Write a protein that binds this ligand. Sequence first.
Ligand code: NI
Length: 341
Amino acid sequence: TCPFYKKIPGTGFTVDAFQYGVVEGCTAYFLTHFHSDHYAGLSKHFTFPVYCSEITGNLLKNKLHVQEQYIHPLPLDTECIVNGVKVVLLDANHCPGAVMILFYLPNGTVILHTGDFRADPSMERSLLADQKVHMLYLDTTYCSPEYTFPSQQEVIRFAINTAFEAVTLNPHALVVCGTYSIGKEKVFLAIADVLGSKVGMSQEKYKTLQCLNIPEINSLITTDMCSSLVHLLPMMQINFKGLQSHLKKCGGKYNQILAFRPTGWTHSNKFTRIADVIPQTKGNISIYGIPYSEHSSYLEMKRFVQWLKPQKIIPTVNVGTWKSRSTMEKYFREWKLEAGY
Ligand code: NI
């Protein structure tokens, strides 16, 4: 049944709650972003109002065939009324189109649902600064102090310098980048930019990217694989067998692959600096696992919450085990006692 942490009290609203059938007493279904654990259940057969960003609404229409009359896109950073309740959508610094939602309840309570987010100090100067938030529904994906990672900027710099060096040493090398959902577009776009190439990809992935309002996108991507030296493939194919196979397909145009797998966190972070990352190599194939995250680190999450000072926190991630829930609650109390709220 629909869990309590997907329901907004004092409203008829749910958030990311599309896989439970008709939720009793739900008058509006919000969708924070286009990732499958969140949209699971949507299709052309859905007949309730869906509230979301413009970008997410482009993806619902084009990829899932949801009928236009049920899609209600909202502008960001703008006070809107939905079924008699004031709401605001804010940038979540996750994947394209991803939002946090501010609810202003009729009784005076203010609720922030982060959806999935990567906290950033820029959030401390949005519409969030202008009033108090009483309850926080929090993306706790990496809520434990072992989760450190570098900035997105440091990671992109590493990937650009690596790719540029390899291809300038060997003009017959191919660069490959893995993907399985929207997000992390900067990885493949920044590499193709430094190399003076478009990124080549399947028709289905090209379609997905054409829904994202990225500036100058027609200049950066293509379905012509032959004219490209940066290819995108399914994340599943980023292994020595899948890459050897791909290289056969290219018809002797290339004699080396350098591949990137942009994971979330991996335990080499506890020890290793970004400067110090090395690939796994077999023959003329090298694979780099790079820690490009679109979720908060523990320290980023902690700073955001200690700035906001909510009266009550409701975790949305890692809620399935008692040991996880109890550990998260302990961190929340530490944070509150250190900061004094
Ligand atoms: Ni997500």
